[PDB]
Amino acid sequence: NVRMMLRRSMYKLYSAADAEEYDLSLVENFKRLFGKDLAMVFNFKDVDSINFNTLDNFIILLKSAFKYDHVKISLIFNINTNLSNIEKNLRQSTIRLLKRNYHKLDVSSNKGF
């Protein structure tokens, strides 16, 4: 669920910053807590098994972070088959949010022999 997603994300974000030297208020307060800008890279390890409604809500939730001037977010999608499953399952509003800045790369072990 979105609640568990945000809680675990903030937990890991705090744990990582603890070695420098649970909610969006942590993201707001990060620059005053550690004096540095925050860049987040999100690794969706297996997209097909993820509840796409929960993922869509989580993406909309993360969209609120752009109000902060010191936060940058990157998204990594491990796709097994194709963009077709994402286009079928996600809402067409969230697809437009993703598509404004995306890259497509075929990392399969088989490529033209």
**Interaction site with other proteins (CB under 8 A):** 1-3, 6, 23-24, 51, 53, 57, 60-61, 64, 81-84, 86-89, 91-93, 95-100, 102
Distances in Å between the Cα of 50 and the Cα atoms of 1, 43, 60, 89 are: 10, 12, 16, 10
Nearer to other proteins, 43 or 92 (CB): 92
Nearer to other proteins, 45 or 111 (CB): 111
Nearer to other proteins, 51 or 74 (CB): 51
Minimum CB separation from other proteins for residue 64, in Å? 5
Minimum CB separation from other proteins for residue 10, in Å? 11
List the chain gaps (C–N > 2.5 A) by preceding residue. Answer: 21
CA distance 77 to 96: 16
Q: To the nearest 5 percent, what fractions of the chain are helix, strand and coil?
A: 50, 10, 35
